[PDB]
Amino acid sequence: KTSFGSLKDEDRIFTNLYGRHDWRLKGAQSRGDWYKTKEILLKGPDWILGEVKTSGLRGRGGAGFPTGLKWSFMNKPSDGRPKYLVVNADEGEPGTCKDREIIRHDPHKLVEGCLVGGRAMGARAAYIYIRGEFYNEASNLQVAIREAYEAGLIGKNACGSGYDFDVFVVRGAGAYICGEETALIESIEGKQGKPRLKPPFPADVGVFGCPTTVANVETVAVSPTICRRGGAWFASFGRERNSGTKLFNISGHVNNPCTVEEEMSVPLKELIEKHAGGVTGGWDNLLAVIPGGSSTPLIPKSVCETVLMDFDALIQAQTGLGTAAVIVMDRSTDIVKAIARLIEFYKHESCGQCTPCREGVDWMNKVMARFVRGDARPAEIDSLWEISKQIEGHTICALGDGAAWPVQGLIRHFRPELEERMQRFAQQHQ
């Protein structure tokens, strides 16, 4: 198969995404949730790991690491310490709101995914680190957790299989840096949300020093569907190493901003034209598209015509897939102002532990503010580029790369715009 997109409603995993049906236990049980879970629990961790590594499912958090291998390093015999699965439900990234709808509208899918994942690695309990601002979603998840506890699906003798598993909900306190897995692990333990250094990986030393696997909501909620329908069913979509379905949040300067599931290798132009209703002012009014939120660099209209929205066709397009969050800017937008706002967001969300981010993100914010005001010279611009090259790869966590990438993308794609802005400032005020 070579033509992707136009996903049929039968193959969509996330039914009741829009909340038109019941989100509680009885509504979810009539859609396919909690069905033959005890058979999977009896088949066990080797079968679950094989079925999730046959599908080719990667990490939907934004790094794209293979889920089978990542859940496979944790499978090892015990050394006296318990094992834990932790679900990253933070989404501090701008443009991304898919897991909010997953938690609010399909919480039992998340709980069943937690149970299947904890069976895969032999985890003792599950910790769900929801965002601090998401009070209603946390309460909905707690209601669904109590409803599953009442029916005997989890807790004592989970689903009639003899396995012990628990689920906990830990609210955040409004931090983007807590979305990072090691910083999330530290913030669970009651400390400041500052990321650790790998090694040690969380599979060896994680939360409370126990073995730990941190997985996204989107890659956890699809695990029972993978283990039930089959790995080849999930692998039948998309390209090779690009298998499955993906949730896209299209927003910005579009007619109908929305969250919609789609085939993993759908073209960007087809997705924008079909689901979002088109760019404001037509397709010819396009200026720039950010494919995966503020971490991923922007791409102009010249590349957006013939691009595919998977991992490989976007890393080859000098950008990244990220969280698959589409931000659309048309011709009536100041790109430098948008990038300056993104850098201001990155400097307002920075843990300040390690030196290069702590100094260089503020430096980039000041330089970008001077760029927006135009009070700068062209010779500074490449210097700003070098500043990004002194941040990427020299930081503890990947917020430094996620802050250096938009500046590099904006410079590389719109150096003439910046040069025109500063020369207009020079010829006007001087």
Partner 1 sequence: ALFVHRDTPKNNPETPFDFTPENYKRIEAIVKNYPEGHKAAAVLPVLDLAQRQNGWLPISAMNKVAEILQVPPMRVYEVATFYTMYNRKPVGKYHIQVCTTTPCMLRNSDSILEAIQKKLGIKVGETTPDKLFTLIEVECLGACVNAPMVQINDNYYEDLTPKDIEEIIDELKAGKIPKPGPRSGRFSCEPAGGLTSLTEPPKGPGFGVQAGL
Partner 2 sequence: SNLIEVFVDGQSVMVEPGTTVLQACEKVGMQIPRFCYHERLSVAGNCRMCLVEIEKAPKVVAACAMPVMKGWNILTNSEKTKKAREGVMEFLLANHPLDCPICDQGGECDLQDQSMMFGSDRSRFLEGKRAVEDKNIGPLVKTIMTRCIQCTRCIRFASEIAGVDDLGTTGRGNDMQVGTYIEKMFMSELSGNIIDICPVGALTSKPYAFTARPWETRKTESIDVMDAVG
Partner 3 sequence: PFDNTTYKNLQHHDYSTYTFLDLNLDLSKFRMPQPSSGRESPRH
Ligand X SMILES: Cc1cc2nc3c(=O)[nH]c(=O)nc-3n(C[C@H](O)[C@H](O)[C@H](O)COP(=O)(O)O)c2cc1C
Ligand Y SMILES: NC(=O)C1=CN([C@@H]2O[C@H](COP(=O)(O)OP(=O)(O)OC[C@H]3O[C@@H](n4cnc5c(N)ncnc54)[C@H](O)[C@@H]3O)[C@@H](O)[C@H]2O)C=CC1
Per the CB < 8 A criterion, the answer to whether 102 and 110 are in contact is yes
- Amino acid 12 reads R
Candidates 342, 343, 334; CA nearest to 421 is 334
Q: Does 91 bind ligand Y (CB under 6 A)?
A: yes
Per the CB < 8 A criterion, the answer to whether 128 and 154 are in contact is no
Question: Least Å distance between CB 228 and partner 1?
Answer: 6
Q: Does 397 bind ligand SF4 (CB under 6 A)?
A: yes
Among ligand X, ligand Y, ligand SF4, none, partner that 351 touches (CB below 5 to 8 angstroms by kind) = ligand SF4
Site string for partner 2, 308-347 (x = CB under 8 A): ---------------------------------------x
Q: Which of residues 260-289 bind ligand Y (CB under 6 A)?
A: none
Task: Please tell me the number of Cα atoms within 13 Å of 393 on its side-chain side.
Answer: 5
Q: Residue 75 has which token pair?
A: 């499978």
Q: Does 86 bind partner 3 (CB under 8 A)?
A: no
Among 220, 338, 397, 411, binds partner 1 (CB under 8 A): 338
In the complex with ligand X, the residue whose CB is nearer, 99 or 112, is: 99
- Kindly state the DSSP code that residue 209 receives in the 8-state scheme: G
**Which region, left, alpha or beta, applies to residue 241 given φ > 0 means left and ψ of -120 to 50 means alpha?**
left
Candidates 198, 278, 201, 227; CA nearest to 47 is 227
Q: Residue 301 has which token pair?
A: 């209209």
| Cis upstream peptide for 94 (omega within 30°) | no
Give the β-pairing of 125-130 and 84-89. Answer: parallel
Q: Does 193 bind partner 1 (CB under 8 A)?
A: yes
Among ligand X, partner 1, ligand SF4, none, partner that 396 touches (CB below 5 to 8 angstroms by kind) = ligand SF4
Give the range of 149-157, 323-331, 375-383, 414-422 binding partner 1 by CB under 8 A: 323-331
> In Å, what is the CA distance from 249 to each residue of 181, 195, 246, 276, 283?
22, 27, 10, 9, 18
Question: Least Å distance between CB 402 and partner 3?
Answer: 30
Number of C-beta neighbours around residue 111 at 10 A:
30
Among ligand X, partner 1, partner 2, none, partner that 52 touches (CB below 5 to 8 angstroms by kind) = none
Question: Least Å distance between CB 157 and partner 1?
Answer: 21
Q: How many residues bind partner 2 (CB under 8 A)?
A: 31
Q: Does 385 bind partner 1 (CB under 8 A)?
A: no
Q: Which of residues 351-410 bind partner 3 (CB under 8 A)?
A: none
Q: Does 395 bind ligand SF4 (CB under 6 A)?
A: yes
Among 45, 56, 62, 94, binds ligand Y (CB under 6 A): 62
Per the CB < 8 A criterion, the answer to whether 195 and 397 are in contact is yes
Q: Which residues bind ligand SF4 (CB under 6 A)?
A: 177, 195, 350-354, 357-358, 395-397, 399-400
